[PDB]
């Protein structure tokens, strides 16, 4: 398999955090283009607050979407407006529905699409823009596309990002790439909602060990100096 190259991502930085405007733009992409077929089940409107949106913006985003279950006085499941506690919508009611509305193929939940695949951010981007004409000698059936990066180079998913597929509210030109980079940052975001935080803990941790180790070693060397200076002498009475 083609091995996606290394891209200079900001969050790839050791002490670098995720660009949150890019996570907001990538959440828009899902909301508009990739949400209808993939499922971000483990990410809920609550997780976004303090990352990409405020409380009222995420509340409006949740109330745009609608829940359809939960019983009623008649034990009558009813459709209601979703809240900050509701999770992201699902593309299809059940796995079979997925196979049905996707040419037999099952679009995997993107909840952790990146942590899932090996190339991770790199792979996702590689494929998103890696759509390419199958060369001579290879022929793909309907519902298949030659994406060098995709295993087998035959991904059922049709190319979902056409330049200017959606308009970024921020206005940043919606070029296919600018969109693939944003959705790769976002998908990364969901897979690790604490990328930034973990990194803040790693900073302070480094500093703390940075002060404790030298000192502890010193002590290790105070309490071991005694012996390390011990001079032995053999004095047979002779």
């Amino acid at each position: 398999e083609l091995h996606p190259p290394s891209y200079p991502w900001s969050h790839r930085g050791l002490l670098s955090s995720l660009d949150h405007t890019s996570i907001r733009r990538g959440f828009q992409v899902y909301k508009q283009v990739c949400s209808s077929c993939h499922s971000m089940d483990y990410v809920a409107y609550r997780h976004l607050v303090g990352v990409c949106y405020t409380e009222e913006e995420a509340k409006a985003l949740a109330e745009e979407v609608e829940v359809q279950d939960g019983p009623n006085d008649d034990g009558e499941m009813f459709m209601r407006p979703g809240k900050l506690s509701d999770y992201f919508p699902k593309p299809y009611p059940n796995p079979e529905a997925a196979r049905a509305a996707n040419n037999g193929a099952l679009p995997p939940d993107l909840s952790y699409i990146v942590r899932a695949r090996h190339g991770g951010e790199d792979y996702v981007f590689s494929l998103l823009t890696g759509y390419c004409e199958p060369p001579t000698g290879v022929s793909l059936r309907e519902g298949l596309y030659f994406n060098p990066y995709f295993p087998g180079q035959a991904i059922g998913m049709a190319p979902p990002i056409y330049t200017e597929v959606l308009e970024y509210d921020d206005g940043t030109p919606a070029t296919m790439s600018q969109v693939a980079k944003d959705v790769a940052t976002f998908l990364r975001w969901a897979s690790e909602p604490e990328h930034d935080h973990r990194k803040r803990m790693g900073l302070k941790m480094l500093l703390m060990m940075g002060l404790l180790l030298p000192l502890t070693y010193a002590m290790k060397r105070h309490k071991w100096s005694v012996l390390k200076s011990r001079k032995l002498a053999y004095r047979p009475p002779k």
């Binding site: 609550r46 809240k83 506690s85 703390m208 002060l211 404790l212 000192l215 502890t216 010193a218 002590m219």
Partner: protein, 55 residues
């Protein structure tokens, strides 16, 4: 003595600061999970109840 012990005292605070932090985060773990906190939501229908009744 003050040089050697100051190092012992310095180190202690550092460890003490880390130890409170580690122990603190665990106590926070046993605390409300984010999801559990997201329950401030609620709804009722006045028509549902007539005088002299609880629901």
């Amino acid at each position: 003595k003050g040089f050697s012990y100051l190092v012992t005292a310095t180190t202690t605070v550092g460890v003490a600061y880390a130890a409170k932090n580690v122990v603190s985060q665990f106590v926070s773990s046993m605390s409300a999970s984010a999801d559990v906190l997201a329950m401030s939501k609620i709804e009722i229908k006045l028509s549902d109840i007539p005088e002299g009744k609880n629901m």
